[PDB]
Design a protein around this nucleic acid. Structure first.
Ligand SMILES: [Mg+2]
Ligand SMILES: [Zn+2]
Ligand SMILES: [Zn+2]
Ligand SMILES: [Zn+2]
Lengths: 67, 115, 144, 48, 261, 192, 49, 56, 46, 421
RNA sequence: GUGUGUCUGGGUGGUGG
């Protein structure tokens, strides 16, 4: 539901790359070009940052059970 | 539930030996080296260095079970040349080669930063 | 108390199942004689029973979630009769068709076909590596 | 009734006399292990 | 009979990866060096967390697992640190551990990112990799208003053989004999195979002529660190660790030889 | 043990390249299919215009269906022969099959050349609708595509009509298994 | 000009399907059956009684 | 229903008010005509009527 | 002894004693949640 | 009770649907031009099964072209898309037309057992059984049908690099070998939620409390001090089998044993961390509690896995990263599956999914695997992959993990969607 | 200066091999 810290296959850190990827997409860069600009050359990491679903945002819509 | 502890692939239990020397009885000058808590990393280098030795006529390593953590190294040598000291020779030559490679890598990175 | 734990001859101790114990290994539906067979126990870490790939054929067993029923014979008489009657080697050949019920399968079969080809030539070190996975080897390296 | 107790497959004869539930038995999924012999079976620690 | 004379030729020394060539050595030695890169280079990663507040949607094991995967600058601390099992302290002592603290409360009506900046270290040399002085930080969890996360975590020395979080590398590109001279791999249609980057061949040729006397001699590496250690330090620590492994085995073998004769 | 440890060196795979053939083989497959459809069209024309003479021991529908089945069986045999003849020694499907480990030459033909004729209860796809198999077909269409003959292979991809017909055949297989289990169970219990 | 070419057909039909699923949804049969029962069938049973 | 998420599964019943003719063999009728007939807007229990002809 | 629950809606802390009606102190909600334990929570960061 | 589906309407061998409808539908969120307007425009209509008997149905608009004999020249209706004949679960399958139909049936059955985020408010619900994956991913190879099944925002598996090879014989008989190092990095980690419920009652009378051996009869020798003073485990408490999860005592009609202990215990084989405890009142006013127990499940040997094509398989051995084979770029497989599982099962959709996933991951794109798309075939994907420096058939020169000797046969390796059952 | 009671009997549905 949240971006994994490490790529499953090789172990490159991709926990810091989700927000930069979203910013590049908002900058009308093609997701292939966005992934290229983030240095993810191995297609394992491209899969990592490309197939991720940002479901933690949907969970944040619900109220906390205690404040 | 029955998952083994993660450390157990490299930590020796309370009491057993790291390596054991067993004589093979069906062939002379043949021994089975039982190294505990080890894998293909040491097995392949020791086997390859033994294969480089001309006084060795057999050298092989085997991991009996991937869920277990021991290797069996079988060495057969010329009648004068005992396989135990052949194994010692292999480890010594490997240490020397690794140290030489390390020092050369160190001077290589030194030169690369220097130009 | 340790006075209770003092064993004497004639007592019976219910020890846990150690290695080499004989068990009857059954898979439903129990169709033919080879559907339940005697097996020797080897202790292994994880939570699944483990089988050699050859016995998957007499059991008609796959590894896509198949479960299996183990039975531990309790008396030494029952253990001995399972050992003398129902062990896997003792029943390789089935009476229903007088042919072996179990054989070489899948990976081993394709690789042994690829292995026995006339063009397969093995280097010395490869021969050393393969020769030591032979439990019946006499230790004499053959002439190339 | 008594006839219902005796007649069924889950009844008394076929359900409790001919075949019955037994002690000293285990069940868990099976996985391959080419390193074992054909007569050997891997067993988990908890089951043993 | 005796050791080889392995020469080294380094082609790339970026701060994230090292590309180098080893000649005059065996295939087994090179592959074992690769294995030691992956699994037998000790680094420091979080392996003990104590959560005393977690109102986040991610449960405690989720947060702990994410924390363990965050890389820490392991340079020069791992040399002097000790394994936690090997240390005499009943707790996590500084000579065998590094304490990390995190306490993030989201009192704002906008979403709070619990980045790797919130992992506050008790030592300056070891810190999360992104904190070193451009590049974004590692997201532990997202917090809305009212949710907190308080935890005290310790980082201990460990190697990849126990857990993947202690792996210092991310992708070890090991390759030898690009032109297929040894024919260790057989192409049914060699023309439709892309040339390797280290290929010495021209565009006309598909693969090199076969050489029976040839053996694997030149090995091509590309060790890409995840930032925890410098890649050159990764290679040197790997060599030293493999050497010390062999030394320990030799010492034990000599002890058994003494005990036997 | 020995054979697996050598398989570490040799290795053994299966992939897309093993399910493909050169341009010549695919041209031959398409030509064989086209000739088969031409023969079926000619037999259909003969039956409609009554040049086709019924064979003894059966009716006119049985004669027509038997001839259509012969033509399509010949087409499947020729396409399978062409596909198998096109294989290389490095083909992994061929390796799995000739070793007898798993698969069959029929599986190779279905994957590479032609899936073949889909059958329901031993005959072609019935006219579930009024005189047609699907609403996409003309009434009284006895051609191959209309009655379940899957021209394409598993590599090229089944057309949706062929997908539905293949689903019907698979459903028949599943139902047969489901009833067979209970029937044989009772027979076995009585026998023991 | 007032026609869809083959190259444009795929995006057109998927737009049509997207519109359908945006409107009807996936469980429309159950909701519609229950709505009909509540709105009409209960009243019809009561009046018919 | 009592905290349990229940789902009603659609039941595939034979259509009503429509005459169907089936080849009910292995019986003393040859052809039969079934009409499961129910009246609209009250759903009184179906009064199926079969019309059949003898076999000879 | 001073058992604390949490309202599902108000997220308020309520001192509810044994065999008491389950009522919020503000909105009177019927559903209450327990606070996280105090003993010790430790996970090896795997 | 009549069943019907929408279909486009064909008149004079032309689609009544024109470019104007699509142009309006593109602005659907703006000018509220809905599917209802399309129905009212006379462009689509619902055709019953009985009506379907007498229609002349066109598979696709290019089937309407009169460049030849044209088969039929009186088409009355046209399918919107042939992929719409598939149900919910069959829509998940990529390239279902490249598979044997029993495999598609098995995947339809097994898609209902795959793990994932079953609902967005799962932390609120107190279902008796619940499985949630740590890191679900939308499939790289995606059919357009599950754009509307909510699959790309509630996915049920992970895109994983599988290599179809016979590595060590532990993947035989439909079994898999998976990367232990990947599993440590969160690959297919999931959480199992178990909920218990209990009600107190008065007729005798029973209450929630922390029982004591001096006033309760016949309890078990389990730690009752895990409970709070009200007889309920607090959240964040590790709990094992035969541990009291709810402390409940019933009074007896008629010392040491004035009450009988009727406490509910955790299931004997189950362990976990208590994560959510709720106390409320039932319909008739008695106290009623629900306790959710959280158990993190690491993928281990024996856990069942399945592709999207009926390629089920229990996990065999797990090898660490160094033991697993690797490409020239250091890309180990996440899973290794046996090649023998393919030929008898005909799951060519598995291979095409791997090829398309490789192309998509290298391209930075999401591949289309809508079943009856003529625009996509194996050759175009192969040419695409060859443009990215890989072998066009998805094969690679793998290296042995134990020895570093490059394997003689080039292994087929690529990303494909996998599911944990 | 100790220690056994573990809600049965039916029905319905789903599932695995
Ligand atoms: Mg079965
Ligand atoms: Zn990666
Ligand atoms: Zn210490
Ligand atoms: Zn409230």
């Amino acid at each position: 539901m949240i971006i994994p810290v490490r790529c499953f296959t090789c172990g490159k850190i991709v926990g810091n790359k989700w927000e930069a990827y979203l910013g590049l997409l908002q900058a009308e860069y093609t997701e292939g070009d966005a992934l290229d600009a983030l240095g993810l050359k191995r297609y394992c990491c491209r899969r990592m940052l490309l197939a991720h679903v940002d479901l933690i945002e949907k969970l944040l819509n619900y109220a906390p059970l205690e404040k | 539930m029955n998952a083994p502890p993660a450390f157990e692939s490299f930590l020796l239990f309370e009491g057993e030996k790291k390596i054991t020397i067993n004589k093979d009885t069906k062939v002379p000058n043949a021994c089975l080296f039982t190294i505990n808590k080890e894998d293909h990393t040491l097995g392949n280098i020791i086997k390859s260095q033994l294969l480089k030795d001309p006084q060795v006529l057999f050298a092989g390593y085997k991991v009996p079970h991937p869920l277990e953590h021991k290797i069996i190294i079988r060495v057969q040598t010329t009648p004068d040349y005992s396989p135990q000291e052949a194994f010692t020779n292999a480890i010594t030559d490997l240490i020397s080669e690794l140290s030489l490679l390390e020092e050369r890598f160190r001077v290589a990175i030194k030169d690369k930063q220097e130009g | 108390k340790p006075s209770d734990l003092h064993l004497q001859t004639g007592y019976k101790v219910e020890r846990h199942m150690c290695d080499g114990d004989i068990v009857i290994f059954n898979r439903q539906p129990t169709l033919h004689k080879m559907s339940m067979m005697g097996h020797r126990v080897r202790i292994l870490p994880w939570s699944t029973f483990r089988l050699n790939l050859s016995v998957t054929t007499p059991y008609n067993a796959d590894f896509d979630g198949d479960e299996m029923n183990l039975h531990l014979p309790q008396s030494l008489e029952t253990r001995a009769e399972i050992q003398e009657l129902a062990m896997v080697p003792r029943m390789i050949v089935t009476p229903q068709s007088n042919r072996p019920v179990m054989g070489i399968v899948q990976d081993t079969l394709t690789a042994v076909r690829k292995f026995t080809k006339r063009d397969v030539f093995l280097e010395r070190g490869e021969v050393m590596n393969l020769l030591m996975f032979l439990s019946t080897w006499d230790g004499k390296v053959p002439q190339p | 009734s008594l006839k219902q107790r005796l007649k069924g497959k889950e009844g008394r004869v076929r359900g409790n006399l001919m075949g019955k539930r037994v002690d000293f038995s285990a069940r868990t999924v099976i996985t391959p292990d080419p390193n074992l012999s054909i007569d050997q079976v891997g067993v988990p620690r908890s089951i043993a | 009979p005796y050791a080889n004379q392995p020469t080294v030729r380094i082609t790339e020394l970026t701060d994230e990866n090292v590309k180098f060539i080893i000649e005059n050595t065996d295939l087994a030695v090179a592959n074992s060096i690769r294995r030691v890169f992956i699994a037998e280079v000790p680094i420091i990663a979080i392996d003990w967390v104590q959560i005393d507040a977690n109102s986040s949607v991610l449960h405690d094991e989720f947060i702990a697992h994410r924390l363990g995967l965050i890389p820490l600058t392991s340079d020069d601390i791992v040399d002097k640190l000790q394994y936690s099992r090997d240390c005499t302290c009943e707790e996590f002592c500084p000579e065998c551990s590094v304490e990390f603290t995190l306490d993030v409360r989201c009192n704002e009506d906008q979403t709070r990112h619990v980045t790797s900046r919130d992992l506050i270290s008790n030592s300056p040399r070891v810190i999360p990799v992104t904190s070193r002085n451009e590049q974004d930080d590692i997201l532990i969890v997202k917090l809305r208003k009212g949710q907190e996360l308080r935890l005290r975590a310790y980082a201990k020395k460990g190697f990849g053989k126990e857990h993947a979080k202690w792996n210092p590398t991310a992708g070890v590109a090991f390759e030898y004999d690009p032109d297929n001279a040894l024919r260790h791999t057989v192409y049914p249609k060699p023309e439709e195979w892309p040339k390797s980057e280290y290929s010495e061949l021209d565009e006309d040729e598909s693969q090199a002529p076969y050489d029976p006397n040839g053996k694997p001699e030149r090995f091509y590496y590309n060790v890409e660190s995840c930032g925890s250690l410098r890649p050159e330090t990764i290679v040197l620590s790997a060599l030293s660790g493999l050497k010390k492994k062999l030394s320990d085995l030799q010492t034990q073998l000599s002890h058994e030889i003494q005990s036997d004769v | 043990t020995v054979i697996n440890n050598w398989l570490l060196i040799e290795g053994h795979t299966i992939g897309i390249g093993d399910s493909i053939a050169d341009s010549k083989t695919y041209q031959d497959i398409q030509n064989t299919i086209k000739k088969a459809k031409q023969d079926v069209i000619e037999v259909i024309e003969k039956a409609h215009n009554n040049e086709l003479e019924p064979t003894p021991g059966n009716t006119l529908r049985q004669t027509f269906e038997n001839q259509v089945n012969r033509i399509l069986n010949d087409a499947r045999d020729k396409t399978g022969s062409s596909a198998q003849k096109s294989l290389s020694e490095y083909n992994n499907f061929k390796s799995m099959v000739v070793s007898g480990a798993k698969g069959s030459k029929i599986n190779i033909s279905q994957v590479i050349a032609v899936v073949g004729q889909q059958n329901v209860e031993g005959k072609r796809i019935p006219f579930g609708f009024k005189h047609r198999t699907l609403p996409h077909f003309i009434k009284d269409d006895y051609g191959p595509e209309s009655r379940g003959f899957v021209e394409n292979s598993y590599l090229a991809g089944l057309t949706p009509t062929e997908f539905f017909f293949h689903a019907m055949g698979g459903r028949e297989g599943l139902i047969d298994t489901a009833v067979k289990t209970a029937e044989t169970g009772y027979i076995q219990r009585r026998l023991i | 000009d007032d026609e869809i070419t083959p190259d444009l057909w795929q995006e057109a039909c998927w737009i049509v399907i997207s519109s359908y699923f945006d409107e009807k949804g996936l469980v429309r049969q159950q909701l519609d059956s229950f709505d009909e029962f509540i709105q009409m069938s209960v009243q019809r049973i009561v009046e018919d009684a | 229903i009592n905290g349990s998420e229940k789902v009603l599964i659609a039941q595939e019943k034979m259509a009503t008010n429509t005459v169907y003719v089936f080849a009910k063999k292995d019986s003393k009728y040859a052809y039969t005509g079934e009409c499961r007939s129910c009246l609209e807007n009250s759903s009184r229990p179906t009064s199926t009527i079969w019309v059949s002809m003898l076999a000879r | 002894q001073p058992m604390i629950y949490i309202c599902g809606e108000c997220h308020t802390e309520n001192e509810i004693k044994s065999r008491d009606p389950i009522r919020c102190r503000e909105c009177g909600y019927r559903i209450m949640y327990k606070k996280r334990t105090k003993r010790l929570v430790v996970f090896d960061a795997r | 009770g009549r069943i019907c589906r929408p279909l486009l309407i064909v008149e004079k061998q032309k689609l009544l649907l024109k470019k104007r409808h699509i142009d309006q539908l593109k602005e659907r969120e703006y000018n509220n031009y809905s599917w209802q307007d399309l129905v009212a425009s006379g462009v689509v209509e619902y055709i019953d099964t009985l009506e379907e008997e007498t229609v002349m149905l066109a598979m696709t608009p290019d089937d309407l072209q009169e460049k030849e004999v044209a088969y039929c020249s009186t088409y009355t209706h046209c399918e919107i898309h042939p992929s719409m004949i598939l149900g919910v679960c069959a829509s998940i399958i990529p390239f279902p037309d490249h598979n044997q139909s029993p495999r598609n049936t098995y995947q339809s059955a097994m898609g209902k057992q795959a793990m994932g985020v079953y609902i967005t408010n799962f932390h609120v619900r107190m279902d008796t059984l619940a499985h949630v994956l740590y890191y679900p991913q939308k499939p790289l190879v995606t059919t357009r049908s599950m754009e509307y099944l909510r699959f790309r925002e509630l996915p049920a598996g992970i895109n994983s690099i599988v290599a179809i090879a016979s590595y060590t014989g532990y993947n035989q008989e439909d079994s898999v070998i998976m990367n232990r190092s990947a599993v440590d990095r969160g690959f297919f980690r999931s959480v199992f939620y178990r909920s218990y419920k209990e009600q107190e009652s008065k007729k005798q009378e029973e209450v929630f409390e922390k029982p004591t051996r001096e006033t309760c009869q016949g309890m078990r020798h389990a730690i009752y001090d895990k409970l709070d003073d009200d007889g309920l485990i607090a959240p964040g408490v590790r709990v094992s089998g035969d541990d009291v999860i709810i402390g409940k005592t019933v009074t007896l009609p008629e010392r040491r044993y004035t009450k009988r202990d009727c406490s509910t215990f955790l299931r004997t084989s189950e362990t976990g961390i208590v994560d959510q405890v709720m106390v409320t009142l039932n319909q008739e006013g008695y106290k009623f509690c629900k306790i959710r127990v959280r158990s993190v499940r690491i993928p281990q040997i024996g856990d069942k896995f399945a592709s999207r094509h009926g390629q089920k398989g229990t996990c065999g051995i797990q090898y660490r990263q160094e033991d697993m084979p690797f490409t020239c770029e250091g890309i180990t497989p996440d899973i290794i599956i046996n090649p023998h599982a393919i030929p008898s099962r005909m799951t060519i959709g598995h291979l095409i999914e791997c090829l398309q996933g490789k192309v998509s991951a290298n391209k930075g794109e999401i591949g289309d695997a809508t079943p009856f798309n003529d625009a996509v075939n194996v050759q175009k994907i192969s040419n695409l992959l060859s443009d990215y420096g890989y072998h066009l058939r998805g094969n690679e020169v793998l290296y042995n993990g134990f020895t570093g000797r490059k394997i003689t046969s080039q292994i087929f390796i690529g990303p494909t969607y996998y599911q944990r059952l």
